[PDB]
């Protein structure tokens, strides 16, 4: 168990890497979030490019073309990509 | 980097532990989700009991008293608990 506590740090660590005493309330523009993962899985997600599901999640940040996103909200964005990939492995049909 | 890919498996692994070929579409009742973490951090979250923020997230599943929740939606639920705890450490006031 304790599988969540492990992820809890992942989201906190990756974010902590950026700013900690952000003079301005936690705020991340579409680019920040988009770049956040890409910068992390830039070389990895390269393999996902084959799957259109990648853009599926982009619809969220993409809509924020000029807008931004709180912060934690990005977590789920990561899941949307997982379910898409996980579906590839699991599929009875 | 690649901090997300690490969490990606965490959510998939913890969930994979349950059912894989779920004869019924991915479905988790309030209890499942609630019990999911508690069963994972049952002894750990015991320390969080001091923080009321714990109930803050419960409001989500709690509302599903008789209802249920897709699945991935639970990811963010984990973040809601993090931001609450993270706030404890970081707080200029």
Taking the domains of chain B in order of start, what are their residue ranges? 1-93
Helix (H, G, I), strand (E, B) or coil at B17: helix
Residue B75 makes CB contacts below 8 A (sequence gap 6+) with: A7, A75, A76, A78, A79, B11
What is the least distance, in Å, from the CA of B12 to any CA of chain A?
A: 8
Query: Which residues fall within 8 angstroms of residue A86, CB to CB, at 6 or more apart?
Result: B12
Q: Which two tokens stand for residue B44?
A: 């750990």
Q: Which residues pair with B49 in a beta bridge?
A: none
SS3 of A52, please? coil
Q: DSSP state, B90?
A: S
CA dihedral B42, B45, B51, B53 (to 10 degrees): -80
User: Residue B7 is nearest to which of A10, A71, A73, comparing CB atoms?
Assistant: A10
Task: Write the class of the CATH domain A1-93.
Answer: mainly alpha
Report long-range pairs for B12-21 (Cβ below 8 Å, ≥24 apart): B12/A82, B12/A86, B13/A3, B14/A3, B14/A4, B14/B40, B15/B71, B17/A3, B20/A90, B21/A90, B21/A92
Q: Is A14 helix (H, G, I), strand (E, B) or coil?
A: helix
Q: Tell me how the structure was determined.
A: NMR
């Amino acid at each position: 168990g304790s599988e969540l506590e492990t992820a809890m740090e992942t989201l906190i660590n990756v974010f902590h890497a950026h700013s900690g005493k952000e003079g301005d309330k936690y705020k991340l523009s579409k680019k920040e979030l988009k770049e956040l993962l890409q910068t992390e899985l830039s070389g990895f997600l390269d393999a996902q490019k084959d799957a259109d599901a990648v853009d599926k999640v982009m619809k969220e940040l993409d809509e924020d073309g000029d807008g931004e996103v709180d912060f934690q909200e990005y977590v789920v964005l990561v899941a949307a990509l997982t379910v898409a990939c996980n579906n590839f492995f699991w599929e009875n049909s």
